[PDB]
Ligand binder design. Structure first.
Ligand SMILES: Nc1ncnc2c1ncn2[C@@H]1O[C@H](COP(=O)(O)OP(=O)(O)OP(=O)(O)O)[C@@H](O)[C@H]1O
Ligand SMILES: Nc1ncnc2c1ncn2[C@@H]1O[C@H](COP(=O)(O)OP(=O)(O)OP(=O)(O)O)[C@@H](O)[C@H]1O
Ligand SMILES: Nc1ncnc2c1ncn2[C@@H]1O[C@H](COP(=O)(O)OP(=O)(O)OP(=O)(O)O)[C@@H](O)[C@H]1O
Ligand SMILES: Nc1ncnc2c1ncn2[C@@H]1O[C@H](COP(=O)(O)OP(=O)(O)OP(=O)(O)O)[C@@H](O)[C@H]1O
Ligand SMILES: Nc1ncnc2c1ncn2[C@@H]1O[C@H](COP(=O)(O)OP(=O)(O)O)[C@@H](O)[C@H]1O
Lengths: 116, 529, 40, 427
């Protein structure tokens, strides 16, 4: 079983529903996710980790969330966990950290049950 | 089978003698006379002092010395719970076995020891402004009502240890509850010698310790070391001597041929002293290497005069009894080198405790923080038999600026008050201060506090300049002759630091222009009083 | 900011379910059946 | 099955040698001799330094070097709770197994390891009243009492990691507690060479690395890099090499003809070294294009004098021992072109740490914020064998205005104190 099928069976770029970004996507694809589509044999032989996140900045209303959801729907990933910044803070001691620590639970569990 | 030599405590003879007399003297005299006197028994002890000086050891050894039950222990806030009325259920269960052997066995019961710990976490003072919290103010009331209440217990003993004796509730320290109060402090030479013997006896027993190691030198060479740091030093030396036989290149294997000749030599002790252990109430050579950057060179007569005056002040503060506090001020023009001389005068003092209060660690502080930092340095200085403190660059400590003028008035009043406060009875203190603007200090009425004054001049003659040049050894014979011919018939006025800077500046041109550049630089740097 | 000091809790229990009598009833009934079978 | 060559660490020979000598030396010598000395075992370690230099890696590699049971972990402030008396329960729950085994077995028990993390988040100095007097002075006393109390433990080892070694308490750092303090810092040339040789071992074995790339001309071109950034550089080179084969834009497609002939070449390293990774203690090329906007045209002699004097001042701070700190002031009439020349002088010195502290990045700040910002830049300047910090337009930093006069005093005092403070020894 080779995990080269992370790429969804069928994908076009322009059909995704995003228009106006053509070098941002190119650079993101090259620098970030070029190691999630190559056959596992070569990636394993070279022994390299994967990029563990990205940052997006710009004006408000130019289509950032859309690109994040499209990135997620590209890699056959699961349902994203959308969160909001000022909705995590709380007034009691030990509540904000509890909120922040409840997002990485399923990842740890599924790492335990099926490793790699 | 108890015997003082078994306990293994050194440097605390008087404290233990007082504790024994006060607490255990009425439980060993024949019962009939103690009944005729009609006196109850003491039921408390408090120990306080700075970190690492032998408090918990004393409590443990007292616990092992008594023919009684197994003492309880309470590791800090271990009696707290989140329900209502549960934080006090665990405070009544401690005294619940001593109240049962008093009803039944009458006046033939046995001591029930209890050992609190970090007592200042659950026994802070109660407020009368109605600002209670709940974690305390109901625990304290129960504890107070249980140690000494309507019904009487005569077969308990309570021990407490803390680092901050200020915060403990007052109603809990009257002669009825915690009557004995002791402070455990740093030892003197005899205490350090006893501690070293105690910690080296075992090694010496099995011919494991070398023959050229002498303990008196180490006792003399460790000044104001606390109880724990001597043990750490010995352990580090042992670790080095033990590692000398282990190889961890590819796999770890022990050489059994050479492992039979294990021995600990004074080289290990010296290396451990240099590299590993660093005390808290002592001094380390880093400061004197960061302030005396380029040593001191005798370019003339005045240097010796300044040093001699410092010597006289040191001797006075060391021998006198009427004046346990003397202070002096060093002042002069800028760039004349008046912060190296203060450091040297302090270093040659050979006092145990030396500190340097400088405004290099207080960048961005508001005046409140500066006041508190100065107060914490002086408070630390009030716990030694001899001391020396250096207040450096006063004008930068008040935040002075010629315009306005403007400065801090809440830091100038924590200095005028701290230059006239004698230490606790029986100790000595010497304060040195350096500034470059005497007149401003004179307008603030700050020259009344200081006891005397010393003056530091600049190079003021061609002969002195040539002597300094020869001492530094930069320019050679022909250049020296040229400079002599070009400067001997004039007057000079320049500080030493600027001289070093000018020499370094002029050593960068090509070899055939250095003297001309140096003379050109020196001509512009010319002034008069 | 103002950090809440903490909190304290109160409790309110509920009736327990022993459900142990039914076992004795069942044992007794089985004995009933045994004796009834023998009598016939 | 433990040997140092497989631990995967480079550039930290001295630190690990000292840690092994002090912490694990007495647990591997034969028990008889150790018992004929009567010595306890060290009980703690502390690691601190800048971000991304190999602390957690060292802790993780120590945790699996020993034959103990699996280590505990505390991922920051995960012991805090709101209800009264629930944090100390979580603190007490860590030492239980060690206590039980010590009570039962005796002097034969195995090691138990606890690995704290971001220790400065829960252990701050006590006595800072009106700041913290609840759940932060009863979560430190419990720890102090448990590490070294009336009951004796001899089978634990504690490890702590922190970026700020000044906030931690003082009674928690004396011989008898956390007492082996190390510092992890930027590596010198040999460190960079060792890290590069560690991070390109698998590729070279399978013949995926071209013979053109040299790992001795790459350790010279990366100055003030830290380990994380060297790793990232290698990864970026690998990604740029891989993506060069995928030729598809609409739907992902993978070639196979050239996929077999896959290799990494010097071009990839050069392309990624100057376009993807940007060190944090290094130079930057954008500043010298945002300040020197129209270049330096030579309109006479007065322009070829400032540069010569700058050259002389640059050469003095590099080959001297009685003057590690220098200073200079450029002043003149307005609209005369001062900042450009300072930028040029800084640029043409070849130092490995050049920074500019300008006042157009502090619009709206107060006095204390300005103090903290300047202090932070200078603090960063003390971790590099050479440096050059530019401070332009002083009167804007002071907020001068001729009416009054009016200005800021605190910033002036900070600036006057930072101009004659020498760096650590040898820098
Ligand atoms: N007088 C002494 N003789 C021998 N050892 C001593 C002495 N004083 C201190 N020590 C050493 O101190 C070690 C522990 O010190 P101790 O428990 O007294 O610390 P403490 O200062 O009461 O604690 P803390 O500062 O953490 O609140 C003992 O194991 C012993 O090695
Ligand atoms: N005879 C000497 N007396 C004093 N300093 C000397 C002497 N010889 C060499 N030096 C060196 O000269 C420097 C003296 O500068 P110092 O730090 O004392 O300046 P300062 O008087 O405090 O100046 P500032 O006005 O900047 O506060 C130190 O490096 C000291 O080592
Ligand atoms: N000395 C080194 N040798 C080999 N690899 C290293 C070294 N230093 C860092 N790395 C690599 O870079 C990564 C840096 O992560 P690491 O856990 O060391 O960060 P850190 O110093 O704890 O970071 P921070 O505390 O700022 O979050 C290591 O996991 C390893 O991949
Ligand atoms: N020979 C030169 N020297 C300096 N700047 C030059 C020269 N030739 C062209 N320039 C350009 O002139 C401008 C120099 O102005 P600069 O930014 O230094 O102003 P300034 O002196 O800081 O001004 P102000 O005092 O008004 O704030 C820059 O664009 C620089 O590129
Ligand atoms: N590049 C784009 N092409 C088409 N529609 C876009 C684009 N960017 C934004 N939109 C429109 O904006 C809306 C979503 O904006 P949103 O992602 O919420 O902005 P932000 O991420 O800044 O909050 C969508 O309804 C979408 O139609």
């Amino acid at each position: 079983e080779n995990r080269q099928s992370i790429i969804n069976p069928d994908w076009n770029f322009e059909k995704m529903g995003i228009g106006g970004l053509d070098k941002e996507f190119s650079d993101i694809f090259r620098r970030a996710f070029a190691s999630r589509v190559f056959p596992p044999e070569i990636v394993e032989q070279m022994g390299c980790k994967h990029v563990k996140g990205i940052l997006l900045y710009g004006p408000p209303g130019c289509g950032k969330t859309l690109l994040a959801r499209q990135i997620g729907k590209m890699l056959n990933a699961r349902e994203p966990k959308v969160v909001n910044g000022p909705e995590i803070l709380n007034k009691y001691v030990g509540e904000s950290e509890a909120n922040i620590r409840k997002l990485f639970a399923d990842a740890e569990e599924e790492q335990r049950r099926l490793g790699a | 089978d108890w015997n003082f030599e078994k306990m293994g405590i050194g440097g605390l003879d008087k404290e233990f003698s007082d504790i024994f007399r006060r607490a255990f003297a009425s439980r060993v005299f024949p019962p009939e006379i103690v009944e005729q006197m009609g006196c109850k028994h003491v039921k408390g002890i408090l120990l306080y002092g700075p970190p690492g000086c032998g408090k918990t050891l004393l409590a443990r050894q007292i616990g092992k010395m008594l023919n009684a039950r197994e003492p309880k222990v309470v590791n800090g806030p271990e009696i707290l719970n989140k329900y209502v009325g549960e934080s006090e259920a665990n405070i009544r269960k401690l005294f619940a076995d001593a109240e049962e052997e008093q009803r039944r066995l009458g006046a033939n019961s046995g001591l029930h020891i209890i050992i609190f710990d970090e007592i200042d976490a659950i026994c802070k003072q109660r407020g009368s402004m109605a600002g209670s919290t709940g974690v305390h103010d109901t625990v304290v009331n129960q504890l107070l009502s249980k140690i000494d209440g309507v019904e009487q217990l005569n077969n308990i003993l309570v021990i407490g240890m803390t680092n901050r004796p200020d915060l403990i509730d007052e109603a809990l320290l009257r002669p009825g509850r915690l009557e004995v109060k002791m402070e455990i402090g740093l030892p003197d030479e005899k205490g350090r010698l006893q501690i070293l013997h105690i910690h080296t006896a075992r090694m010496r027993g099995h011919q494991l310790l070398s023959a050229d190691v002498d303990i008196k030198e180490l006792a003399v060479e460790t000044k104001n070391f606390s109880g724990a740091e001597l043990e750490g030093l010995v352990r580090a030396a042992q670790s080095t001597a033990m590692n000398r036989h282990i190889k961890a290149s590819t796999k770890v294997e022990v050489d059994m041929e050479k492992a039979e000749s294990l021995q600990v030599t004074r080289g290990d002790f010296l290396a451990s002293l240099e590299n590993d252990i660093k005390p808290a109430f002592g001094t380390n050579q880093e400061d004197y290497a960061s302030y005396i950057m380029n040593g001191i060179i005798k370019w003339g007569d005045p240097v010796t005069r300044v040093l001699d005056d410092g010597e006289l002040l040191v001797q006075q503060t060391k021998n006198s009894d009427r004046t346990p506090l003397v202070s002096v001020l060093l002042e002069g023009p800028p760039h004349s080198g008046k912060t190296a001389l203060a450091a040297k005068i302090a270093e040659e003092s050979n006092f145990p405790f030396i500190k340097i209060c400088s405004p290099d660690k207080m960048i961005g502080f508001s005046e409140t923080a500066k006041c508190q930092a100065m107060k914490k340095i002086f408070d630390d200085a009030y716990k030694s038999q001899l001391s020396c403190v250096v207040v450096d660059d006063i004008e930068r400590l008040l935040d002075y600026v010629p315009i306005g003028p403007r400065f801090s008035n809440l830091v100038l009043q924590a200095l005028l008050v701290l230059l006239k406060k004698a230490p606790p009875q029986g100790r000595k203190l010497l304060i040195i201060g350096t500034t470059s603007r005497k007149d401003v200090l004179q307008e603030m009425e700050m020259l009344n506090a200081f006891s005397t004054t010393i003056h530091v001049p600049n190079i003021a003659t061609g002969e002195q300049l040539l002597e300094a040049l020869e001492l530094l050894g930069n320019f050679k014979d022909k250049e020296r002759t040229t400079i002599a011919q070009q400067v001997k018939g004039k007057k000079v006025w320049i500080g030493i630091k600027k001289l070093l800077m000018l020499i370094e500046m002029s050593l960068q041109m090509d070899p055939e222009y250095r003297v001309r550049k140096f003379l050109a630089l020196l001509r512009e740097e010319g002034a008069s009083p | 900011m103002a950090e809440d000091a903490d909190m304290r809790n109160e409790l309110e229990e509920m009736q327990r379910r022993a459900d142990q009598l039914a076992d004795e009833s069942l044992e007794s009934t089985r004995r009933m059946l045994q004796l009834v079978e023998e009598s016939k």
